């Protein structure tokens, strides 16, 4: 049996009453047809609100029961609207064991002052003869065992609410909150007027260029008088946000200068991100400018995509004056482009 | 396998439900034709809004099912306007194997309060025959599988654009290698007589309690040496490994005192992961000290599931000397187990 | 012990059970023992 | 209907018992064509109004 994620147990509560009813010298029945004698009211400890009793007709009720002892069970008090039950009757023999035990397989709906039983419970002459021994010392033993069904309940058992759950990953949050709180001021980098706070190890691990001059045994003077002018402090703040938070949302409008900052800082992943953003930025008028920036910054994938763009859109890229500017300014670029075309196009005169 | 420049994967995500349903006193069916018996609403870990339930008529729906037990599947709660699903029904015998297994060939479309099932599901006399063993001790067992299909998605995977490889987050392994390089440690740190060269900045960054008491009148003097002796260095190094790398591979050998240190250091993620380790380490003999440690270190769900283990194995966990020692040491643990065993179970 | 097993859904709400828990640790052993190895292991 | 007075009212002659999941009602309630007819006003302004007494 495989373990399920959810399951259910159905419990129909059942209570049982066991009752022993002995009448002595039954042959002094004292009455003809129509005789009824009841028992004392009885119940169990729980819930002590459903009281029962018995009723017997020694001669019978109707013409079918001229020679039949009849036994009936009725409910004498009930606080609820209705209660269903199944009952079983029995007659002890002389030794005391069950004999002629006959029951009803259907659960009858009981209510205040309702009876259910068997008119043909047993043959009166069969009880009266002493051959079968069912009347020991002229005493009549009746064993009544009744089972009451209650309202069904369900526990709604859920098992392995799924597992335990775990919180979100906490790499970027603990650094972003530390930067927002700006606590533990290790150094003050007053660059281009504005001052920025950071630590040593985070920048040394993130940028090998930042690790380079701090590996040279001079830090207390370099942090006081750091000289940063190749990159403006706005893009330096963007680098700070990309290091700590892990995202650069406004990179699309500032791909080129962050690319230059990545080339200066030897951040290969940042260079890859800038190249990926500027790859889907090519147009028909400034593709020569993007090629010039890629050639200056040694952007391999960007330069390859610019070469493919020129080779496919040569009917419009060469029309612009930006293509003619690089012809005059870089004849070596013209030579390598012409050789790349000629080596690719080996056939044709 | 021919090489293709473009790939495409039409992924249809399927969610599978497992459900067990037992009926006690089924022969006391209490009714004639027309009775319905619902069950508890249940769902797996798919948004906790796909609630299902079962309807059973023990005699039949109509005259064509007089000698037939009818079994139906009903959907009560769903976030979507409509959900299509394909289901399988089977009954268990006394020995637990599946018999009388039939299945609905179509992924039927369900909607709020719509019924689908088998009216002529099984012969009533076939269940009533005790020689088949289908009704052991008047227990009626059904096993149900629900397979919900959702809207497909496509990945459209071009095969090697991706002209440049994209590295993942290197903040884990760079900080992990920084520990073995032992670089840029501004202060020393010795625990239990053994030196573990550690600096206070990343410790304050990635543990809130140490960030609390480091700045309060101890970083000025006792920064070069901090005294920690509640846990051995063998677990301290893995603790700092989880601080720096973000993961602790060494778990099952020493998950106990790692929890003892985690509750001391207020470590929300380290509580639950070693908790899940000891959940699989729940056995009969060691459950006494499992309940001891879970309550002493306030692992509430571990307490709950270990108490459920005691509930499911209460026949034999008691006579162990470990459980007797757990009793004579922690009366409130036995009181809480009594509370769960009495108020919730019965 | 049979009484506390059968009516324990309301016994533990009263302050007498809490006084029992605080003062007598060892009787809860037998109280849980007869409840554990009798009369509700059917799950 | 459109005016709001009760039309086509049918009631149950027996006190049917109900358990969680048991239904009772009239599957042969009203002709769909008789409902979709406009002269009787049973479908006013593309709105269906029902009056429930339990």
Q: How far is B331 from chain C (nearest CA, A)?
A: 5
- CB of B194 closer than 8 Å to CB of B233: yes
Residues A11, A9: Cα–Cα separation, whole Å: 6
CB contact under 8 A, A201 and B201: yes
8 Å CB contact between A270 and A260: no
Give the Å distances, CA to CA, from B279 to A148, A241, B87, B339. 42, 41, 32, 21
SS3 of A198, please? strand
DSSP state of A27: T
Q: Taking CB atoms and an 8 Å limit, are B338 and C33 in contact across chains?
A: no
Cα–Cα distances in angstroms (integers) from residue A63 to residues A34, A68, A122, in the given order: 11, 10, 15
Q: Which residues contact B264 (CB under 8 A, 6 or more apart)?
A: B230
Residue position matching structure tokens 């995509």:
A305
Burial zone of B333 (CB within 10 Å; 0-12 exposed, 13-18 middle, 19+ buried): buried
State the Cα–Cα distance between residues B238 and B216, nearest whole angstrom: 26
Which are the residues after which chain B is interrupted (C to N > 2.5 Å)? 160
Contact by Cβ (8 Å): B113, B83: no
Q: Give DSSP secondary structure letters for B265-296.
A: TT-HHHHHHHHHHHHHT--TTTHHHHHHHHHH
Alpha-carbon span B56 to B36, nearest angstrom: 6
Quick count: other Cβ atoms within 10 Å of Cβ B89? 22
Tell me how many degrees the CA angle C17-C20-C24 measures, rounded to the nearest 5. Answer: 155
How many Cα neighbours within 13 Å face the side chain of A226?
22
Measured CA distances, A161 to B43, B48, B148, B275 (Å): 10, 8, 19, 16
Distance between CA B125 and CA A46 in Å, rounded?
Answer: 36
Residue A137 to residues A29, A59, A89, A93: CA-CA distances in angstroms?
15, 20, 21, 11
Query: Cβ distance A147 to A102 under 8 Å?
Result: no
The pair of three-digit structure tokens given for residue B258, joined into one six-digit string = 């790692």
| B260-to-B192, B263, B280, B296 alpha-carbon distances in Å | 17, 6, 18, 9
Q: For residue B261, what are the contacts with CB-CB under 8 A and spacing of at least 6? A: B230, B231, B235, B236, B239, B267
Task: Report the 10 Å Cβ neighbour count for B317.
Answer: 22
Looking at residue D15, what DSSP letter applies? -
Q: Beta strand A6-24 with B14-24: parallel, antiparallel or unpaired?
A: parallel
Give me the phi and psi of B124, to 5 degrees please.
-70, -40
As a dihedral over the C-alpha atoms of residue B280, residue B283, residue B287, residue B291, rounded to 10 degrees, the angle is 20
CA count, 13 A, side-chain hemisphere, D25: 9
Question: How far is the C-alpha of B308 from the C-alpha of A158, rounded, in Å?
Answer: 12
DSSP A305-342: HHHHHHHHSHHHHTTSHHHHHHHHH-HHHHHHHHHHHH
How far is A336 from A291, CA to CA, in rounded Å?
14
Q: What is the DSSP letter of B79?
A: S
Q: Determine the length of chain C.
A: 43
CA distance B248 to B273: 10
For residue A136, what is the DSSP state? G
Interchain proximity C41–B315, CB inside 8 Å:
yes
Q: In whole angstroms, what is the distance from residue C14 CA to residue C32 CA? A: 18
**Chain-centre distance for alpha carbon B45:** 9
Task: Tell me the chain B residues in contact with residue C2 when contact means C-beta distances shorter than 8 Å.
Answer: none
Tell me whether the omega of the peptide bond preceding residue A47 falls within 30 degrees of 0, making it cis.
yes
Q: Do chains D and C touch (3 or more CB pairs under 8 A)?
A: no
Encoded tokens for B82: 């409509």
End-to-end CA distance of chain C: 22
CB contact at 8 A, B38 and D21: yes
CA distance A187 to A177: 18
- List C residues 1-43 in contact with B (Cβ-Cβ < 8 A): 5, 8-9, 11-12, 17, 21, 24-26, 28-29, 31-33, 35-37, 40-41, 43
In chain C, the residue whose alpha carbon lies closest to the alpha carbon of B316 is C37
**What are the tokens at A121?**
């419970």
Residue that is written with structure tokens 């479908």 in the block: D43
- Contact yes or no, D with B (3+ CB pairs under 8 Å): yes
Helix B331-339 with B321-329: angle, nearest 10 deg = 100
DSSP string, chain C: -HHHHHSHHHHTTSHHHHHHHHH-SSHHHHHHHHHHTSS-TT-
The SS3 call for residue A42 is strand
**B199: closest CA among A74, A199, C3, D13?**
A199
Q: How many CB atoms lie within 10 A of CB B71?
A: 19
Task: Please give the span between the terminal C-alpha atoms of chain A, in angstroms, as a whole number.
Answer: 79
Cross-chain CB nearest to C28 (options B318, B331, B345): B331
C-alpha to C-alpha distance for B198 and B243, rounded to whole angstroms: 11
Beta bridge partners of B42: B52
**What is the spatial distance between Cα A124 and Cα A347, in angstroms, rounded to a whole number?**
123
Task: Please answer whether residues A157 and A8 qualify as being in contact, where contact means their C-beta atoms are separated by less than 8 angstroms.
Answer: yes
Contacts of B41 in chain A (CB under 8 A): 156
- CB atoms near residue A211 (< 10 Å): 17
Compute the distance between CA of residue B191 and CA of residue B20 in angstroms, rounded to an integer: 52
Angstrom CA distances, A204 to A212, A239, B183, B204, B240, stand at 8, 14, 11, 18, 20
Residue B255's nearest CA partner among B232, B233, B279, B277 is B277
Q: Which residues 306-325 of chain B have a CB within 8 Å of chain C?
A: 311-312, 314-315, 318, 324
B84 touches chain D (CB under 8 A): no
The kind and range of the H/E element at A145 are strand A139-154
CA angle, residues D18, D20, D26, in degrees to nearest 5: 50
């Amino acid at each position: 049996g495989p373990v399920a994620e959810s399951w259910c147990y159905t419990q129909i509560k059942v209570v049982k009453f066991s009752y022993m009813w002995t009448i002595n010298n039954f042959s002094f029945c004292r009455e003809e047809m129509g005789e009824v004698i009841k028992s004392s009211t009885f119940s169990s400890g729980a819930n002590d609100k459903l009281k029962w009793c018995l009723r017997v007709n020694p001669k019978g009720l109707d013409e079918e029961s001229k020679d039949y002892l009849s036994l009936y069970l009725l409910l004498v008090s009930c606080p609820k609207s209705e209660v269903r039950a199944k009952f079983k009757f029995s007659i002890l023999n002389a030794k005391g064991e069950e004999t002629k035990a006959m029951e009803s397989q259907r659960a009858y709906r009981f209510v205040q002052g309702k009876d259910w039983g068997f008119k043909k419970f047993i043959r009166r002459d069969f009880l009266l003869d002493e051959a079968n021994g069912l009347l020991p010392d002229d005493k009549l033993t009746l064993f009544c065992e009744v089972s009451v069904v209650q309202d069904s309940v369900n526990i709604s058992g859920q098992n392995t609410m799924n597992m335990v759950k775990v919180p979100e990953c906490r790499l970027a949050d603990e650094l972003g909150g530390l930067w927002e709180n700006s606590r533990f001021t290790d150094c003050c980098l007053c660059v281009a007027g504005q001052e920025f706070q950071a630590h040593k190890a985070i920048l040394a691990a993130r940028s090998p260029v930042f690790s380079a001059m701090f590996e040279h045994e001079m830090e207390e003077s370099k942090k006081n008088r750091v000289e940063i002018n190749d990159v403006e402090p706005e893009v330096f703040k963007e680098m700070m946000c990309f290091i700590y938070t892990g995202k650069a949302p406004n990179l699309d409008k500032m791909a080129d200068d962050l690319l230059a900052a990545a080339d200066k800082y030897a951040l290969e992943r940042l260079k890859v991100m800038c190249e990926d953003a500027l790859c889907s930025n090519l147009s028909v008028e400034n593709a020569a400018e993007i090629l010039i920036l890629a050639d200056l910054h040694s952007a391999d994938q960007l330069k390859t995509q610019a070469v493919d763009f020129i080779n496919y859109h040569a009917s419009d890229v060469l029309e612009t004056s930006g293509w003619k500017s690089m012809v005059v300014s870089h004849p070596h670029l013209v030579a390598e482009a012409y050789r790349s075309l000629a080596s690719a196009q080996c056939p044709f005169l």
